[PDB]
Amino acid sequence: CPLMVKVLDAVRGSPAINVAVHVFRKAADDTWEPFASGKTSESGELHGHTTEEEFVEGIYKVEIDTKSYWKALGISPFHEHAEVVFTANDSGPRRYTIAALLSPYSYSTTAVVTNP
Amino acid sequence: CPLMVKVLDAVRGSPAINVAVHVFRKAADDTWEPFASGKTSESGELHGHTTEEEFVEGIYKVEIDTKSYWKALGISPFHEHAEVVFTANDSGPRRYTIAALLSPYSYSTTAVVTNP
Amino acid sequence: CPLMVKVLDAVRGSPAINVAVHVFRKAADDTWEPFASGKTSESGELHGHTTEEEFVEGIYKVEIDTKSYWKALGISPFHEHAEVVFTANDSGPRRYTIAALLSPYSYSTTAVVTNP
Amino acid sequence: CPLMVKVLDAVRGSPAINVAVHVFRKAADDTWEPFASGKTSESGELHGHTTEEEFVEGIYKVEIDTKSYWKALGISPFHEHAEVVFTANDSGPRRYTIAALLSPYSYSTTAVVTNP
Incomplete structure (x- = not known):
């Protein structure tokens, strides 16, 4: 999965677990099209089953539901x-x-970007 | 002005000058209505000429044009x-x-939130 | 004052007030000689009452007493x-x-470094 | 190795490779005693052969040679x-x-602190 998201809690010094993450890709008509979503694991990492094939060029948006985490x-x-x-x-x-x-x-x- | 924006440049060790900033108020119909906009000053600040009265409770978005700044x-x-x-x-x-x-x-x- | 310190609190969304700050100049014998010190103000700033003349080129250390602040x-x-x-x-x-x-x-x- | 150090470059969006890292532990007489050192790998991670046994309670200092990295x-x-x-x-x-x-x-x- 060429798109990974990792979330950390700076108050506790720990991974931020169970955080909802939604990923969107900008479509031809300028709207955001749903691309992937999930919840962070016990390591604060997002459970993505995205493939290199479907991860084409474009503008992506990663939205992290921080408010629900703190609440x-x-x-x-x-x-x-x-x-x-x-x-x-x-x-x-x-x-x-x-x-x-x-x-x-x-x-x-x-962001860390690597060329495999 | 109850809403100020300040932008700093970590590469140069300076305020980020002439950066475009747009502020929006969320409208009842979950749509972003323009609220204030400008370019940051030599001190990295955006004027904000809005008044306390128009700055009602609500969800605000601040969009900073970082890509143009770096280019x-x-x-x-x-x-x-x-x-x-x-x-x-x-x-x-x-x-x-x-x-x-x-x-x-x-x-x-x-956010540096201070009560007058 | 050519050397100012400003401290913000990311948990409360406010200046960090009453935080102890010590500034040192490195001495020829690689030892840290006291240079300035104080507690941050209600705006999170440390006075700095040093003058341009005494603030010669050199290696300076700024030590912020973050542990007392959190306790x-x-x-x-x-x-x-x-x-x-x-x-x-x-x-x-x-x-x-x-x-x-x-x-x-x-x-x-x-560091926000500005040339007067 | 219960002490890991990871360094990233925010200008390039990459791990910071070949960065010198020295680790010290505060000794009984108040001085810093050398504890470990190394250079970061291609993943920006420090090559520590520290054991759980020698990693006792105390005050530790991790010094990262950022100046040589940028230079x-x-x-x-x-x-x-x-x-x-x-x-x-x-x-x-x-x-x-x-x-x-x-x-x-x-x-x-x-810092992320975990209890294995």
């Missing part, structure tokens, strides 16, 4: 979710790891 | 833009500063 | 403190802002 | 190095992953 822990956070929008595979197939680091009023997101 | 500096960026979505003024009007620190393959965002 | 808020922290080491004024006197954004298990630091 | 890529960075100081194993053995994300004028460091 379940009793915390009322600032952000509704964390969104990451990026062009993928514009110069050939790559493997992408989108990392998100979560705090109640702050998040950071980083 | 103008000649560095290849990962993200299409940086989008921050949050609920404002629940528990009453505060001053919000949305701060964003930019790198080509990473960004972080934090 | 005062009742949250278990990871780090003993946050230490930023940098060379200043090579290429001439600038204004330096060392900004630090704190979470219990994570911190980031950035 | 080798032609960039003159702000920081001399990135230091992470923390108490380990104070409540029993844990596995620690220290992650550092590097930009020329900024870095962030995060």
